[PDB]
Design a protein around this motif. Structure first.
Motif, short mmCIF file in Angstrom:
data_model
loop_
_atom_site.label_atom_id
_atom_site.label_comp_id
_atom_site.label_asym_id
_atom_site.label_seq_id
_atom_site.Cartn_x
_atom_site.Cartn_y
_atom_site.Cartn_z
N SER A 1 77.68 42.84 52.21
CA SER A 1 76.36 42.54 51.68
C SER A 1 76.29 41.07 51.28
CB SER A 1 76.04 43.44 50.49
OG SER A 1 74.75 43.17 49.98
N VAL A 2 75.83 40.24 52.21
CA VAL A 2 75.71 38.79 52.03
C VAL A 2 74.38 38.56 51.30
CG1 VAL A 2 76.25 36.59 53.23
CG2 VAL A 2 76.76 38.79 54.33
N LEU A 3 74.12 37.30 50.89
CA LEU A 3 73.10 36.92 49.90
C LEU A 3 71.72 37.51 50.18
CD1 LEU A 3 73.77 34.82 47.53
CD2 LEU A 3 75.32 34.48 49.48
N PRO A 4 71.06 38.09 49.18
CA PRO A 4 69.74 38.69 49.39
C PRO A 4 68.60 37.72 49.11
CG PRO A 4 70.55 39.30 47.24
CD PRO A 4 71.57 38.35 47.82
N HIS A 5 67.44 38.06 49.68
CA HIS A 5 66.19 37.28 49.58
C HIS A 5 66.39 35.85 50.06
CE1 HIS A 5 65.47 40.72 46.99
NE2 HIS A 5 66.39 40.27 46.16
N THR A 6 67.16 35.70 51.13
CA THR A 6 67.45 34.40 51.72
C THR A 6 66.91 34.36 53.14
OG1 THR A 6 69.62 35.12 52.51
CG2 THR A 6 69.50 34.14 50.32
N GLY A 7 66.35 33.21 53.51
CA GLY A 7 65.82 33.00 54.83
C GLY A 7 66.63 32.00 55.62
N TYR A 8 66.00 31.45 56.65
CA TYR A 8 66.65 30.41 57.43
C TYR A 8 66.77 29.10 56.67
CZ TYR A 8 66.36 33.31 61.62
OH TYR A 8 66.51 34.30 62.55
N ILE A 9 65.95 28.90 55.65
CA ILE A 9 66.00 27.69 54.85
C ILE A 9 66.76 27.90 53.55
CG2 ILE A 9 63.94 26.73 55.90
CD1 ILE A 9 62.37 27.73 53.69
N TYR A 10 67.55 28.96 53.46
CA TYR A 10 68.62 29.01 52.47
C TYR A 10 69.94 28.56 53.06
CZ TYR A 10 71.68 30.73 48.78
OH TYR A 10 72.61 30.82 47.78
N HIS A 11 70.18 28.87 54.34
CA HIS A 11 71.37 28.44 55.05
C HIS A 11 71.17 27.12 55.77
CE1 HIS A 11 72.98 32.32 54.05
NE2 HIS A 11 72.06 32.95 54.76
N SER A 12 70.23 26.30 55.31
CA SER A 12 70.08 24.95 55.82
C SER A 12 71.11 24.03 55.18
CB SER A 12 68.69 24.41 55.54
OG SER A 12 67.71 25.18 56.20
N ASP A 13 71.41 22.92 55.87
CA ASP A 13 72.38 21.97 55.34
C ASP A 13 71.85 21.25 54.10
OD1 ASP A 13 70.96 20.85 57.97
OD2 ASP A 13 71.18 19.17 56.57
N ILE A 14 70.54 21.07 54.00
CA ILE A 14 69.99 20.37 52.85
C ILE A 14 69.85 21.28 51.64
CG2 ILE A 14 67.48 20.68 53.06
CD1 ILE A 14 69.59 17.41 52.67
N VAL A 15 69.98 22.59 51.83
CA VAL A 15 69.98 23.54 50.72
C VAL A 15 71.41 23.93 50.36
CG1 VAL A 15 68.86 25.73 49.96
CG2 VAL A 15 67.77 24.23 51.63
N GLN A 16 72.37 23.67 51.24
CA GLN A 16 73.78 23.84 50.92
C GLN A 16 74.44 22.54 50.46
OE1 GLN A 16 75.71 26.84 51.25
NE2 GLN A 16 73.75 27.90 51.57
N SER A 17 73.66 21.48 50.25
CA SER A 17 74.19 20.17 49.85
C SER A 17 74.20 20.01 48.33
CB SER A 17 73.36 19.08 50.50
OG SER A 17 71.98 19.26 50.20
N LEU A 18 74.73 21.01 47.64
CA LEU A 18 74.57 21.17 46.20
C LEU A 18 75.44 22.36 45.75
CD1 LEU A 18 72.25 23.64 46.16
CD2 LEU A 18 70.70 21.78 46.38
N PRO A 19 75.74 22.47 44.45
CA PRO A 19 76.57 23.59 43.94
C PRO A 19 75.97 24.96 44.23
CG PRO A 19 76.62 21.84 42.36
CD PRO A 19 75.74 21.35 43.48
N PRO A 20 76.80 26.01 44.24
CA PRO A 20 76.32 27.35 44.63
C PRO A 20 75.30 27.96 43.69
CG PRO A 20 78.68 27.21 44.91
CD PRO A 20 78.28 25.98 44.17
N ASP A 21 75.25 27.55 42.42
CA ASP A 21 74.23 28.06 41.53
C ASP A 21 72.97 27.21 41.55
OD1 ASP A 21 75.55 30.35 40.68
OD2 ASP A 21 76.62 29.28 39.09
N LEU A 22 73.03 26.04 42.16
CA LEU A 22 71.87 25.18 42.34
C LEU A 22 71.02 25.57 43.55
CD1 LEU A 22 71.06 22.40 40.81
CD2 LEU A 22 73.33 23.26 40.22
N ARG A 23 71.33 26.70 44.20
CA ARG A 23 70.89 26.98 45.56
C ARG A 23 69.51 27.63 45.62
NH1 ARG A 23 75.51 25.53 48.51
NH2 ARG A 23 77.36 26.79 48.06
N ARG A 24 69.34 28.76 44.92
CA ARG A 24 68.17 29.62 45.09
C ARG A 24 66.88 28.90 44.74
NH1 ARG A 24 67.92 34.78 47.10
NH2 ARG A 24 69.83 35.21 45.91
#
Length: 156
Positions: free
Chosen positions: A89-112
RNA sequence: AGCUUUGCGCAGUGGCAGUAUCGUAGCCAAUGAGGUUUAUCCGAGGCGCGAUUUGCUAAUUGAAAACUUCCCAAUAGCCGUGACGACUAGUCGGCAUUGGCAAUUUUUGACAGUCUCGAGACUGG
């Protein structure tokens, strides 16, 4: 070189070496084919949707343009659905712009929260290039400066 | 004309008040705050910093708790006595102060309780 001096490994066959050779050759074929697709999709997506490609990145821009059904369906979607665009069960309520490089360019709690920042502004960008204004992409540049200005604002 | 809805203001009854009520000039925020539920869904303020007027009354310590006291001297019943006076050693009136005023006729308590229909009875072992 250090661990090839002491390998503890036996030699291959000629069939094994040629099998691995054609496997590596088709692997480089897949890599160069992937990068050719990337160059084409970034060129044609900067022509089709320049501002969205500038904000998110043109490959993710093409993904969320495609699963929504084009630009003129991407505009008349709200910001709360383009966030979940490309979901499942990988991350919920996530789209294609959660797994973008500019949304992963930050700490894991800074993400949503950052997703909601990139989903909203690119939605504006999507609306801005549903009509054919800002063809040079100044709205995308201004909004992307706003995005990473807020990202640097949250970060230390 | 009456009923009535919503928002705001005023006053009143009551309730609550430090996981309450606010300020924010710093930033962010419907061009989306914040989302683990239902997420092609929800939709409002959020993070930090900083707060928690006025009058009346009580009580305490303190010499004094903030609205224009202490001290000395003197003045403010009768039986005796001393004079003065009056009337015949005695009597009387007023004045004065150098002793006394709980032992039957008076002023240091035969009073107290009880009962009966203005009137009496019982007890104080």
């Amino acid at each position: 070189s250090v661990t090839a001096s002491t390998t503890q490994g036996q030699q291959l066959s000629e069939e094994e070496l040629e099998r691995l050779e054609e496997a590596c050759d088709m692997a480089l074929e897949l890599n160069a084919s992937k990068h050719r697709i990337y160059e084409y999709v970034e060129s044609r997506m900067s022509f089709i949707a320049p501002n969205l490609s500038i904000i998110i990145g043109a490959s993710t821009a093409a993904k969320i343009m495609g699963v929504a059904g084009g630009l003129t369906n991407l505009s008349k979607m709200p910001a709360c659905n383009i966030m979940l665009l490309g979901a499942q069960s990988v991350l919920p309520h996530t789209g294609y712009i959660y797994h973008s490089d500019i949304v992963q360019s930050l700490p894991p709690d800074l993400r949503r929260k950052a997703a909601r920042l990139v989903a909203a502004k690119c939605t504006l960008a999507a609306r801005v290039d549903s009509f054919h204004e800002s063809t040079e992409g100044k709205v995308g540049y201004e909004l992307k400066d706003e995005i990473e200005r807020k990202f640097d604002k949250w970060q230390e």
